[PDB]
Amino acid sequence: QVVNFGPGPAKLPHSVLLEIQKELLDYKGVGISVLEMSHRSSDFAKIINNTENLVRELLAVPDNYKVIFLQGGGCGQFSAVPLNLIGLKAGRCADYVVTGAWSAKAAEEAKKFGTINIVHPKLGSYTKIPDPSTWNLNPDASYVYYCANETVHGVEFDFIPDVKGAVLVCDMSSNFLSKPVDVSKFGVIFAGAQKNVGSAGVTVVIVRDDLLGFALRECPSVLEYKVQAGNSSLYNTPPCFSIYVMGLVLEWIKNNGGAAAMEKLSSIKSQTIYEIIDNSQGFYVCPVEPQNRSKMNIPFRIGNAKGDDALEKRFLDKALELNMLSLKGHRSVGGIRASLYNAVTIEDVQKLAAFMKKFLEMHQL
Amino acid sequence: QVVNFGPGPAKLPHSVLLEIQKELLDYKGVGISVLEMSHRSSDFAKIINNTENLVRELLAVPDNYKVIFLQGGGCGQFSAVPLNLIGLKAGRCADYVVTGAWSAKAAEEAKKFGTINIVHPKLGSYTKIPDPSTWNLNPDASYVYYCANETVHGVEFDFIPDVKGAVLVCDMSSNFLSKPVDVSKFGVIFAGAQKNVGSAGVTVVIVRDDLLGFALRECPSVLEYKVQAGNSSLYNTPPCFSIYVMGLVLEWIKNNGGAAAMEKLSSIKSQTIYEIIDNSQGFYVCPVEPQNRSKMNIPFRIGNAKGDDALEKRFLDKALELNMLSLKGHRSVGGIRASLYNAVTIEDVQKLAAFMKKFLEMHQL
């Protein structure tokens, strides 16, 4: 019955958790657990190769791109991206687009490795994507960074920005494989697996193969793109079980229609919630401009623009009573947040939709 | 019927794999998998705190020591230790003890962050520990680094070396919680979970609380001891499932007598194999001096000291027919290597003992 609206780590498909359970003591007959499996064995080589192929297949990754699986999460890439790329041009400058909490954290972290310049004026509220025409781009910048989907504020790019030919780095942790992606436009894409593509413990990084070999001296070898691509992500012991779980979710996505189907399913899901908000007559307020609304994370308030705390606690308390978990908004924003990642089914959103309507039908004045 | 002598990732207790399997879909009745569990939930807080408590209990870690769980494996700490500690003193020097392959790698990685002086002359063969009284120690070095147990060459410290008051850092990946440890004599202890206390994906680090706040600017935030100790290993998403698995293994060690019992069980196991080698009349050759022989990894050759390729293939071939996995020595050394970590039972070792005895009785000249 439990409906898991978790923001990350999130819900995994039930069929995947069933297979992990039944294979847990004897993976496909070899007689051991994946938790016991050597990363140098023929069996795990087949696991990590199939996981990489699915990333290339589902996203249509061109052959001039490496696909490596690192540790440290997305916040690790907040340091791995500058350590690997900020020396690409001698100036060691990088231009950053800050559309929410995770772009801000990444921009601040990069200040530890070079001079970071935010290309747009500071926004009073994380409610819109600054028009790319307003971007003040440095022609000598080593790269340009932006976050595809801001998990805390629900601001998402439905376009790949024009960065005047500079190398493009994109944080796609919260919408990875929720839609097709023109990988050819990017220099580095990274995404933590714990939102749309697996369990916590592994990060997928897609790097253009000529962007290796610019890493700083202080870059840890386990986080250097050049080192890990040359060892097929096996420079040291990889998160074997996380990569095994990730490949199963990737297989689940492929059986369900790939990135194209995920885009359609995430449209039906997000539209179901935005439809309640847009016709709520101010009872639900979503502050994001409609043309930048995320299809993965829908944060909103109850009552008014700043939110009525008394009504929102009653919403969450009744929501928890119905076994709908992790609907509380992020600590820094409060309010409500619904995360509708790939594993969240339509029936799961249909339960949330029915509850929001009955709650609105009981408290609108 | 599989006997798993893996070097890391290694064997987990059958009891632990059963509980992980039973609760994989509905952990302790909360309705979700740990793979789906949020790191901000009350449920995960119980897990990671109990995991931290068990490390403190089983090792008797003093209160002035932080216990943190990081990503990146042991090779991750090969960079995190210099980044966090090489700047204790302004010289940015560090003394390293190279007793095998893993201390050799850590010494080379540290050269990326400072001037590294290896305290002793090159050994020519990794068969002994250089005498600590002959160690050329730098009084202005920031710390002294050594690997307690060399997994590839089978050289293990049965003592804590006197570094004349320097901050002592130790790589205990391959013998962590195989014996009691006087933590007070160390500044930093770290260990990858996959060898003796769990599954790959998480690394435990024990740091004295006065050694924080010396990290270099280039240290990634997810690898900075101060940042991660201040957030109780929750600066970003931790390897939740790997920390969950480790807590069950630690609970298993506690139920089986703690570190004190692990030490004596490790003696029974290693003595069973080392005596077979010592009475083999040269049919089995272990080149490590007996006073430095590892109790965790026993590498040896068959036929003669340099190795009989024909006999070693049949040994590994017949061992595979009998479902004894991962007995092949490391790629860099060849020969045979038997890993006898905590979950490897005396019953497991007796199968290796009987087979080694029968192979000697059938090919000794």
Author numbering:
A (entry chain C), B (entry chain D): 6 to 370
Q: What text comes from the article?
A:
Phosphoserine aminotransferase (PSAT) catalyzes the intermediate step, the pyridoxal 5′‐phosphate‐dependent transamination of 3‐phosphohydroxypyruvate and L‐glutamate to O‐phosphoserine (OPS) and α‐ketoglutarate. Human PSAT (EC 2.6.1.52) is a pyridoxal 5′‐phosphate (PLP)‐dependent enzyme whose coding gene is located on the long arm of chromosome 9. Each monomer exhibits the well‐conserved α/β fold of fold‐type I PLP‐enzymes with two distinct domains.
In the substrate‐free structure, solved at 2.5 Å, the main differences between the eight chains were found in the catalytic site and involved the state of the cofactor: in chains A, C, D, E, F, and H, the electron density clearly showed PLP covalently bound to Lys200, forming the internal aldimine. Instead, in chains B and G, PMP was present in place of PLP. The presence of sulfate is probably due to its high concentration in the crystallization medium; nevertheless, it mimics the binding of the phosphate moiety of the natural substrate. In our substrate‐free structure, where a sulfate ion occupies the phosphate binding site of the substrate, the electron density for Arg336 varies between the different chains, sometimes clearly interacting with the ion. In general, we suggest that this residue is flexible and might have an important role in locking the substrate during the reaction. We thus conclude that sulfate and phosphate itself can bring about most of the conformational changes needed for the open‐to‐closed transition.
